[PDB]
Amino acid sequence: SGEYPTVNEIPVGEVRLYQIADGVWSHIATQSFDGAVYPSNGLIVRDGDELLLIDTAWGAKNTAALLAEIEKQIGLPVTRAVSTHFHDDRVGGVDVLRAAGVATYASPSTRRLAEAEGNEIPTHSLEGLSSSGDAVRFGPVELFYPGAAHSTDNLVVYVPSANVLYGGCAVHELSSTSAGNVADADLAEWPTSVERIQKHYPEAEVVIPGHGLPGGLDLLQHTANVVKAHKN
Ligand SMILES: C[C@@H](c1cccc2c(-c3ccc(=O)[nH]c3)c(C(=O)O)[nH]c12)N1C[C@]2(C[C@@H](CN)C2)OC1=O
Ligand SMILES: [Zn+2]
Ligand SMILES: [Zn+2]
């Protein structure tokens, strides 16, 4: 009823949307992995009379529910989607999107890693993002490669119209006490990559993590702290 949704307020197999700013929503879904339940976030950005989707809802059925929730709450067509790294909470559901007529995009590095690991594979390659600090425009957002962090391929997304920074899983929520799932992370480079984000988006007003509650710029420094301490 207004608060940011958690696993406790999302019906089973359901998706909720949360208005972040004018023409910017996050989407929140729930999924089970290795016997535990987790929330995860993505982004929706108005693209004129179309919508740009950032990341799936972690699963084919979740992502079908996501499209239905978008049509119910927003009513504009999702035409393009970007996956910010190769894990299932970012690409799981790309096959559903592609069959729905959504054009799916990711960096070549993400597409390679998804294919190698048996995850669903976005159709289109996003060039110009292979060196840390690279940035390219994509409809109403800027895509930024900060360097290796939560994964070697993780991208972040900035909505300049609203100064919204979508950090993806390279950014953790403030309540985070751990670095999350670090199976594919580079703990040594992660703080340097967060520093690049901080330097590049100093005017960010909202910071959205890959999982958990949005906040302000403090999420960036907190993420660095938790990752450095995890490594220690
Ligand atoms: C699908 C994703 C995933 C699954 C379950 C939980 C998480 C969390 C997380 C978030 C908060 C928290 O408190 N704990 C855990 C994150 C995260 O931090 O982004 N990712 C999760 N995967 C799977 C995988 C691939 C590898 C295969 N060998 C394992 O590495 C991942 O990042
Ligand atoms: Zn991940
Ligand atoms: Zn994640």
Structural domain total, the chain: 1
Calpha distance 44→62 (Å, rounded): 15
In a domain, 3, yes or no: no
In a domain, 52, yes or no: yes
- Cα of 180 vs centre of ligand 1, distance in Å, is 6
In a domain, 128, yes or no: yes
Q: Are 208 and 165 in contact (CB under 8 A)?
A: yes
- Method of determination is X-ray
Domain that holds residue 104: 15-231
In a domain, 95, yes or no: yes
CATH number of the domain that residue 129 is part of: 3.60.15.10
Q: Is 156 helix (H, G, I), strand (E, B) or coil?
A: strand
The number of the ligand 1 atom at minimal distance from the alpha carbon of 88 is: 1
Q: Are 39 and 212 in contact (CB under 8 A)?
A: yes
In a domain, 10, yes or no: no
In a domain, 2, yes or no: no
Q: Could you tell me where the beta strands, DSSP code E, fall in the chain?
A: 15-21, 24-33, 36-47, 50-54, 78-82, 103-106, 124-125, 135-138, 141-144, 156-159, 164-168, 206-209
* Packing angle, helices 218-231 and 190-200, rounded to 10: 170
**Residue owning the nearest CA to atom 15 of ligand 1:** 180
In a domain, 99, yes or no: yes
Structure tokens at 62: 């979740």
- Cα of 183 vs centre of ligand 2, distance in Å, is 8
In a domain, 5, yes or no: no
Give every strand in the sheet of 135-138, ordered side by side: 135-138, 141-144, 156-159, 164-168, 206-209
